[PDB]
């Protein structure tokens, strides 16, 4: 269980459960950053980024996705660290799902506003 996190602080670091050890099977995590209008959240992935992937289909197993207003980033998976995101928003949703198998270390991000 890792759904429904809510952060109103302007700074923080967020990780997949158990990072940098493997994240649980069948994860459904969500993290909302809820700041006053006018703040603009910037996000960066840090350290090891390792989400299961597939060699032909884009992120069909596990992934992180970020939403702010109508804008979506991701899904992201694999071993490449996503590029930094300047959301231009005060209200951000970070979603992570995993399927029922595999072994991958997960992700770490920091945010600021």
- Check binding of 52 to Ca ion (CB under 5 A): yes
- Check binding of 53 to Ca ion (CB under 5 A): no
52 is in an annotated binding site: yes
Number of H helices, E strands in the chain: 0, 9
Residue 24 Cβ vs Ca ion, minimum distance, rounded to whole Å: 10
> Do residues 106 and 22 lie in contact, with contact meaning Cβ atoms separated by under 8 Å?
yes
Q: Binders of Ca ion among 54-113, rule CB under 5 A? A: 61-62, 98-99, 102
What is the C-alpha to C-alpha distance for residues 82 and 68, in angstroms, rounded to an integer?
Answer: 16
* Of 33-41, 49-57, 69-77, 83-91: span binding Ca ion (CB under 5 A): 49-57
Partnered with residue 37 across adjacent β-strands are: 39
State the residue for tokens 């109508």: 70
- Check binding of 50 to Ca ion (CB under 5 A): no
């Amino acid at each position: 269980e890792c759904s429904g996190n809510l952060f109103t602080q302007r700074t923080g670091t967020i990780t997949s459960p158990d990072y940098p050890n493997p994240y649980p099977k069948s994860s459904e995590c969500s993290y909302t950053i809820d700041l006053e209008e006018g703040f603009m959240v910037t996000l960066q992935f840090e350290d090891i980024f390792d989400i299961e992937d597939h060699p032909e289909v884009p992120c069909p197993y596990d992934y992180i996705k970020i939403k702010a207003g109508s804008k979506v980033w991701g899904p992201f998976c694999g071993e490449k660290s996503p590029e930094p995101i300047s959301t231009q928003s005060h209200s951000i949703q970070i979603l992570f799902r995993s399927d029922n198998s595999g072994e991958n270390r997960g992700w770490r991000l920091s945010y600021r506003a």
